[PDB]
RNA sequence: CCCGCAGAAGAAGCACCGGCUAACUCCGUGCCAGCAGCCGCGGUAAUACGGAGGGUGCAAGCGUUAAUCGGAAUUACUGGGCGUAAAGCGCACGCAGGCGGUUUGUUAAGUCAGAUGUGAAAUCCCCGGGCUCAACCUGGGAACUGCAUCUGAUACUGGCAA
RNA sequence: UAGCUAGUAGGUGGGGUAACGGCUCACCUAGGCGACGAUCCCUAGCUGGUCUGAGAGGAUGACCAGCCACACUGGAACUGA
């Protein structure tokens, strides 16, 4: 079984590659409130079947570009 | 090579060697892989002067580890029985 | 048997048509060393007249505090007008580790083993009243299991 | 704009015990009726009940021993601006264990002493020592 | 207050400025003592306080007080200064170590001799 | 170390008898106690509550002869130990063998009993020790060596201790001037006149 | 390490003493000389300066300076405030953000429990062992408050549906 | 210090490397990062730890161990696992 990260597409303007923001509730170190923190990731996808505002599962692969080391697995939750 | 050797600890004129598995390129008291026993030459004849994990050492020499000369004399004076 | 202790003496002033009139105010505490403490505050024109006027106010303002075999029952807070005394039972955390003007109100009540800290204004008149109401707000396990729970074994396991 | 109904429940108990009201009524809820059962089985209140069908009304009859309240202090620890969860080993003892802490564990709400012997921790709700 | 505001901007620790800014983390420095003179203190006191205007070896140029009763400083004496203000003189932050490198010990001290640097009246 | 000085003037500052000169002279008529710790000894101070914590530390130190940096390390090893810090502190001072052989009677004074350890004379479990600070384990014998024993008045310092207390957690025999160490003492066993609360409270400030 | 031998013989200072802060008088000096961490002492009877006697503290060290934390709840998460002491925007509307009534179902992200891998050794801590004791050295354990995966729990928070 | 970036961001293809990769070229697309702080400026070896503190924290990185960087200054490659 593989580490699969979910997240939502921010932008898709770059030709079989996509950027996905990932949210994580991290408890703050000092104060203790659970802060919502984002995490951007450049994700690869052949046959680029995704648009902006779209919940994607991604997984970590070998480096495919200067910034891309994550690749698409499947698209759930299609944008309207 | 990966060697099984001593590493001098203790005080001045009162040594304490710890038999240890390390890459031979490291320092004497430097980076090692795992500690596998100890040896006290100032043992004071009480109960203990040397304790070695023999099944853990024999695991290493079956992978290609090389036991150095002083600790090779230590596994002979344990005698593997008495 | 009714061990006393003098905390502080000030020299207060009055400023009348002639000059200024000096008076001395003595703050004392008394206690039996058993869980009964009271404090007095007397002022007079001489120092020994004030310290014995303050003992008489202290002997009739004694309150009963339930302490748990030389120490407190639970941690307690003690606010009174600028003093914010905190205490802790410190289960044979030996000694009265407490500040001045609180060290002496605890040693006459019979408390032997507190940890305590005075926050805020450490004025000796206010920190004495700050512990004394803080001591009487502390309640016993056999008196808190008199209103809720309703046996000592239930509230302590 | 009423963003914590649980702290509104403890505030009504606190103000009701201060004002020497004999009973306190509030809009009911599934969580309020749960932690009211913890206070009733522990002896801080008496005889809580729920009257109503669509807009139910939780009603608690407060407790007095002598001319004084029973809940001397009732604080709210995990307010919605800052949630507080605790493990099993650092569940708090309130007033040295002679006042309870209502913790919401995965087996329902219970006291801290009940959650220790059950072996699990959770979101601590209130110190009702 | 308001923990959600402290997340946005944490508690700014008040920085602490040093009180003797002649190369901090140095217990003493050395300077050449130009213009040894004497000045007058602030208002409730009155004396003639004997000061230097030493030029330190790091390039700073500060004033320093000379303790004890009577000194031997003359305009080029390379001395050793340390911390400690005087409160009576407007902007004298340093003392001279009496006993070090050009500053003789105070004549006929018999008490607190390690300050003012005199060596144990032998006979 | 060891203060070297007028050993009874320390007893006059604390106003008590610290048992520092009871060697051959029986009693302390020749001291003028309670009236002159110095030139102004006729005065009485108000003695603020820091001072009564200080004088309780200096009483306990001057009884056992321990100086401060060694006494502070006793407090650190009585804080981290289990139980009563004030009782562990007195139990550590009553475990040094210069105090132990004083308690066994081999020295008429704790200052003599430690100079009997600078005689290379006292011997526990076969070994000569030279260490006043040696903590004695509670199954032990101590003995005088054959060399520097029977030094007549040091033997006569032993019969002096039959007139003093005969403590509980010890035995002696005076056979070869031999003794043994039972359990560590209780708080009720020892002197029960000093307030170890004040020493524990002193180091917390 | 041990044995033997002239042998008390070769071996005690430094700071402080008005208050805080343990410990005092006398002489000298007269807002001078000076002290001083702070408050402040000194202008003819100085427990504050300088000697002396006496004392207190520590001790092969003792003071001073520098530096950091503490005390300082004086950056307050634990643990502070804002009528007049410093402090509520001149007043609204509002995007991002934070927070969210009530009921059921579901999900199991937060959360909780358990396990596994890891969290180097040394230090720190506990019970021991060895140097005549101690410092020191060392055995074993705990700890390393973490992170990741797995399997559960479903009260609460979030998601989704009504 | 509020905008930064043009091999910059991505794609295809060739080359290159022990190996993935704008690592390097040609071409095509016009992107990429940024108010959860990019860029710029000043300072700084990092960690296990140490000191302080009841703790949370604050300060710190001497010795000893792990990692990194450097070898008169600025470059470059050669040999070689």
The DSSP annotation for A7-39 comes to EEEEE--SSSEEEEE--EEEE-SSS--EEEE--
Q: Which positions in strand H are less than 7 Å from the protein's CB atoms?
A: 9-12, 20-23, 29-34, 36, 57-59, 64-67
How far the first Cα of chain E sits from its last, in Å, is: 70
The answer to whether A27 CB sits below 7 Å from nucleic acid chain H is no
Q: How far apart are CA C106 and CA C39, in angstroms?
A: 11
Is residue D63 within 8 Å of residue C147, measured between CB atoms?
Answer: yes
A/C touch flag: 3 or more CB pairs below 8 Å:
no
Enter the CATH code of domain E1-123.
Answer: 2.40.50.140
* Neighbors of chain A with 3 or more C-beta pairs under 8 Å: D, E
The answer to whether F146 CB sits below 7 Å from nucleic acid chain G is no
* Mutation target vs C (from F46, F47, F49; most C CBs, 10 A cutoff): F49
Of the candidates B24, B15, B54, B23, which has an alpha carbon nearest to the alpha carbon of residue B36?
Answer: B54
Check whether residue D57 and residue D92 sit in a common domain: no
Instruction: Copy the structure tokens of residue A20.
Output: 């996905």
Q: What are the contacts of F33-42 at 24+ separation with CB within 8 A? A: F36/F12, F37/F9, F37/F12, F37/F13, F41/F12
Please indicate if any CB of chain E lies within 8 Å of the CB of D3: no
Residue B28, helix vs strand vs coil: coil
Which chain D residues contact residue C148 at CB under 8 A?
Answer: 42-44, 63, 70
Which of 3-62 (A) contact E at CB < 8 A?
28, 30-33, 35
The answer to whether B8 CB sits below 7 Å from nucleic acid chain G is no
Please indicate if any CB of chain E lies within 8 Å of the CB of D81: yes
Residue range of the domain that includes B71: 1-81
Helix (H) or strand (E) holding F160: helix F152-160
Q: How far apart are CA D101 and CA F196, in angstroms?
A: 39
The dihedrals phi and psi of F26, each to the nearest 5 degrees, come to -70, -60
Residue range of the domain that includes D111: 72-129
Which chain D residues contact residue E3 at CB under 8 A?
Answer: 81-82
Domain count, chain B: 1
Task: Tell me the nearest-neighbour CA distance from D37 into chain C, angstroms.
Answer: 14
Q: How far apart are CA D33 and CA D38, in angstroms?
A: 9
Residue of A nearest to E3 (CA): A31
Is residue F75 within 8 Å of residue F203, measured between CB atoms?
Answer: yes
Which chain E residues contact residue A28 at CB under 8 A?
Answer: 7
Beta bridge partners of A19: A11, A42
Q: How far apart are CA E111 and CA D74, in angstroms?
A: 65
Residue F181, helix vs strand vs coil: strand
Instruction: Copy the structure tokens of residue C32.
Output: 């039996």
Q: Enumerate residues 6+ apart whose C-beta is below 8 A from D88.
A: D115, D116, D119, D120, D121
Instruction: Copy the structure tokens of residue F139.
Output: 């199954």
Beta bridge partners of B9: B16
Residue ranges per domain, chain F? 7-93+190-203, 94-181
C78 alpha-carbon distance from chain centroid:
10
Helix (H) or strand (E) holding D118: helix D112-118
- Cα–Cα separations (whole angstroms), residue A11 to A33, A38, A75, C48: 30, 15, 15, 86
Task: Tell me the nearest-neighbour CA distance from A65 into chain E, angstroms.
Answer: 35
- Cα–Cα separations (whole angstroms), residue F12 to F7, F35, F67: 10, 8, 19
Is residue E60 within 8 Å of residue E40, measured between CB atoms?
Answer: no
CA of residue B67 to C1' of nucleotide G137, angstroms: 26
Phi-psi region of C150 (alpha: psi -120 to 50; beta: other; left: phi over 0): left
Q: How far apart are CA F73 and CA F93, in angstroms?
A: 11
CATH class assigned to F7-93+190-203: mainly alpha
Of the candidates E45, E37, E48, which has an alpha carbon nearest to the alpha carbon of residue E73?
Answer: E37
Q: How far apart are CA F203 and CA C50, in angstroms?
A: 34
SS3 letters across C17-55: CCCCCCEEEEEEEEECCCCEEEEEEEEECCHHHHHHHHH
D/C touch flag: 3 or more CB pairs below 8 Å:
yes
Of the candidates F172, F170, F200, which has an alpha carbon nearest to the alpha carbon of residue F184?
Answer: F170
DSSP label at residue A62: S
Is residue E95 within 8 Å of residue E82, measured between CB atoms?
Answer: yes
Is residue E95 within 8 Å of residue E65, measured between CB atoms?
Answer: yes
The answer to whether D53 CB sits below 7 Å from nucleic acid chain G is no
- Cα–Cα separations (whole angstroms), residue F200 to C110, C113, F77, F80, F126: 17, 11, 12, 13, 37
How far the first Cα of chain D sits from its last, in Å, is: 28
Domain count, chain D: 2
Sign (positive or negative) of CA dihedral F78, F84, F87, F91: negative
Please indicate if any CB of chain C lies within 8 Å of the CB of D108: no
Please indicate if any CB of chain D lies within 8 Å of the CB of A36: no
Q: What Rg, from alpha-carbon coordinates, does chain D have?
A: 14
Check whether residue D46 and residue D93 sit in a common domain: no
Taking CB atoms and an 8 Å cut-off, how many pairs form between chains C and D? Answer: 34
D102 alpha-carbon distance from chain centroid:
6
Q: Is C18 exposed, middle or buried (0-12, 13-18, 19+ CB in 10 A)?
A: exposed
Instruction: Copy the structure tokens of residue C38.
Output: 């009271």
Of the candidates C147, C55, F4, which has an alpha carbon nearest to the alpha carbon of residue D44?
Answer: C147
Final residue in a domain of this structure, among D21, D37, D71: D71
Q: Enumerate residues 6+ apart whose C-beta is below 8 A from F191.
A: none
Sign (positive or negative) of CA dihedral F66, F69, F75, F78: negative
Q: Which residues in 84-113 of chain F line strand G, with CB less than 7 A from it?
A: none
Q: How far apart are CA D93 and CA C156, in angstroms?
A: 11
Smallest Cα–C1' distance to nucleotide G36: which residue has it? E86
Final residue in a domain of this structure, among D71, D91, D121: D71
β-pairing, E61-65 vs E94-96, is parallel
Q: Enumerate residues 6+ apart whose C-beta is below 8 A from B33.
A: B2, B20, B21, B22, B23
Q: What angle do CA D105, D111, D116 make, to 5 degrees?
A: 70
- The secondary structure of chain A in percent helix, strand, coil, rounded to multiples of 5, reads 0, 50, 50
Is residue F59 within 8 Å of residue F194, measured between CB atoms?
Answer: yes
F94-181 maps to CATH 3.10.290.10: yes
Final residue in a domain of this structure, among D39, D56, D71: D71
Task: Tell me the nearest-neighbour CA distance from D82 into chain A, angstroms.
Answer: 5
Q: Which residues in 9-68 of chain E line strand G, with CB less than 7 A from it?
A: 11-14, 16, 18-20, 24-28, 41, 44-50, 67-68
**Resolution number, Å:** 2.9
Check whether residue D43 and residue D97 sit in a common domain: no
Residue with tokens 């208002």: E43
- Cα–Cα separations (whole angstroms), residue E18 to D108, E15, E24, E51, E93: 57, 10, 8, 22, 11
* Neighbors of chain D with 3 or more C-beta pairs under 8 Å: A, C, E
List residues in chain F touching C: CB distance below 8 A: 49, 83-86, 197, 200-201, 204
Which chain E residues contact residue D82 at CB under 8 A?
Answer: 3
SS3 letters across F58-118: HHHHHHHCCCHHHHHHHHHHHHCCCCCHHHHHHHHHCCEHHHHHHHCCCCCCHHHHHHCCC
CA of residue A61 to C1' of nucleotide H26, angstroms: 28
The dihedrals phi and psi of E36, each to the nearest 5 degrees, come to -80, 125
Is residue A8 within 8 Å of residue A53, measured between CB atoms?
Answer: yes
Check whether residue D79 and residue D64 sit in a common domain: no
Residue D14, helix vs strand vs coil: helix
Q: How far apart are CA F190 and CA F187, in angstroms?
A: 6
Q: F111: number of CA atoms within 13 Å, CB side?
A: 18
Q: Say how many C-beta atoms besides its own lie within 10 A of residue C8's C-beta.
A: 16
Residue C58, helix vs strand vs coil: helix
Q: F104: number of CA atoms within 13 Å, CB side?
A: 32
Instruction: Copy the structure tokens of residue D39.
Output: 């206070």
Is residue C25 within 8 Å of residue C50, measured between CB atoms?
Answer: yes
Sign (positive or negative) of CA dihedral D62, D65, D67, D68: negative
Query: Using what technique was this structure determined?
Result: cryo-EM
Q: How far apart are CA F91 and CA F99, in angstroms?
A: 11
DSSP label at residue D33: H
Report the CATH number at residue D56: 3.30.1370.30
Of the candidates D98, D31, D35, D97, which has an alpha carbon nearest to the alpha carbon of residue D70?
Answer: D98
Task: Tell me the nearest-neighbour CA distance from D25 into chain E, angstroms.
Answer: 31
Which of 13-72 (C) contact D at CB < 8 A?
none
The DSSP annotation for C60-89 comes to TS-EE---BTTB-SS-EEEEETTEEEEEE-
Residue of E nearest to D79 (CA): E3
Which chain E residues contact residue A30 at CB under 8 A?
Answer: 6, 10
Instruction: Copy the structure tokens of residue D114.
Output: 């009940």
E/A touch flag: 3 or more CB pairs below 8 Å:
yes
Which chain E residues contact residue A31 at CB under 8 A?
Answer: 3, 6-7
């Amino acid at each position: 079984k593989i580490r699969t990260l979910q997240g939502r597409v921010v932008s898709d303007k770059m030709e079989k590659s996509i950027v996905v923001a990932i949210e994580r509730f991290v408890k703050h170190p000092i104060y203790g409130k659970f802060i919502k923190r984002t995490t951007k990731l450049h994700v690869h996808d052949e046959n680029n079947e995704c648009g902006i505002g779209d919940v994607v599962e991604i997984r970590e692969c070998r480096p495919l570009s200067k910034t891309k080391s994550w690749t698409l697995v499947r698209v759930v939750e299609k944008a309207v | 090579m990966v060697t099984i050797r001593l590493a001098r600890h203790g005080a001045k004129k009162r040594p304490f060697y710890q038999v240890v598995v390390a890459d031979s390129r490291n320092a004497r008291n430097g980076r090692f892989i795992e500690r596998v026993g100890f040896f006290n030459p100032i043992a004071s004849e009480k109960e203990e002067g040397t304790r070695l994990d023999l099944d853990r050492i024999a695991h290493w020499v079956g992978q290609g580890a090389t036991i150095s000369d002083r600790v090779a004399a230590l596994i002979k004076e344990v005698n593997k029985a008495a | 048997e009714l061990q006393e202790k003098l905390i502080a003496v000030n020299r207060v002033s009055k400023t009348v048509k002639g000059g200024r009139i000096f008076s001395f105010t003595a703050l004392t505490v008394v206690g039996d060393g058993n869980g009964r403490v009271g404090f007095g505050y007397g002022k007079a024109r001489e120092v020994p007249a004030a310290i014995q006027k303050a003992m008489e106010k202290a002997r009739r303002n004694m309150i009963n505090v339930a302490l748990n075999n030389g120490t407190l029952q639970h941690p307690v807070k003690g606010v009174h007008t600028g003093s914010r005394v905190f205490m802790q039972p410190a289960s044979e955390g030996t000694g009265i580790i407490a500040g001045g003007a609180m060290r002496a109100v605890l040693e006459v009540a019979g408390v032997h083993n507190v940890l305590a800290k005075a926050y805020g204004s450490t004025n000796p008149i206010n920190v004495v009243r700050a512990t004394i109401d803080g001591l009487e707000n502390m309640n016993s396990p056999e008196m808190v299991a008199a209103k809720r729970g309703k046996s000592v074994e239930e509230i302590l396991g | 704009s009423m963003q914590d109904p649980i702290a509104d429940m403890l505030t009504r108990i606190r103000n009701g015990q201060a004002a020497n009201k004999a009973a306190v009524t509030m809009p009911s809820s599934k969580l309020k009726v749960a932690i009211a059962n913890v206070l009733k089985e522990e002896g801080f209140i008496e005889d809580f009940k729920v009257e109503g069908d669509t807009k139910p009304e939780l009603e608690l009859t407060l407790k007095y021993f002598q001319g004084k309240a029973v809940v001397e202090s009732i604080q709210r620890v995990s307010r919605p601006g800052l949630r507080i969860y605790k493990r099993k080993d650092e569940l708090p003892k309130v007033m040295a264990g002679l006042g309870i802490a209502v913790v919401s564990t995965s087996k329902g709400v219970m006291t801290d002493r009940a959650a220790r012997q059950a072996g699990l921790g959770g979101e601590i709700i209130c110190y009702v020592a | 207050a308001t923990v959600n505001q402290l997340v946005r901007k944490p508690r700014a620790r008040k920085v602490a400025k040093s009180n003797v800014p002649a190369l901090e983390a140095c217990p003493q420095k050395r300077g050449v003592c130009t213009r040894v003179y004497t000045t007058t203190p602030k208002k409730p006191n009155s004396a003639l306080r004997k000061v230097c205007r030493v030029r330190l070896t790091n390039g700073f140029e500060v004033t320093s007080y000379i303790g004890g009763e009577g000194h031997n400083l003359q305009e080029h004496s390379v001395i050793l200064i340390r911390g400690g203000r005087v409160k009576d003189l407007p902007g004298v932050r340093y003392h001279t170590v009496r006993g070090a490198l050009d500053c003789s010990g105070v004549k006929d001290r018999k008490q607190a001799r390690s300050k003012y640097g005199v060596k144990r009246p032998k006979a | 170390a060891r203060y070297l000085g007028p050993k009874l003037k320390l007893s006059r500052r604390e106003g008590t008898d610290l048992f520092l000169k009871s060697g051959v002279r029986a009693i302390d008529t020749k001291c003028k106690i309670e009236q002159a710790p110095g030139q102004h000894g006729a005065r009485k101070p108000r003695l603020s509550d820091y001072g009564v914590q200080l004088r309780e530390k200096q009483k306990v130190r001057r009884i056992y002869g321990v100086l401060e940096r060694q006494f502070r390390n006793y407090y650190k090893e009585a804080a981290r130990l289990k139980g009563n810090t004030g009782e562990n502190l007195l139990a550590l001072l009553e475990g040094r063998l210069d105090n132990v052989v004083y308690r066994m009677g081999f020295g008429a004074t704790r200052a003599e009993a430690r100079q009997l350890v600078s005689h290379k004379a006292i011997m526990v479990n076969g070994r000569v020790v030279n260490i006043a600070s040696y903590q004695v384990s509670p199954n032990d014998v101590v003995s005088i060596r054959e060399k520097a024993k029977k030094q007549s008045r040091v033997k006569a310092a032993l019969e002096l201790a039959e007139q003093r207390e005969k403590p509980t957690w010890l035995e002696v025999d005076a056979g070869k001037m031999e003794g043994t160490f039972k359990r560590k003492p209780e708080r009720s066993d020892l002197s029960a006149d000093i307030n170890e609360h004040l020493i524990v409270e002193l180091y917390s400030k």
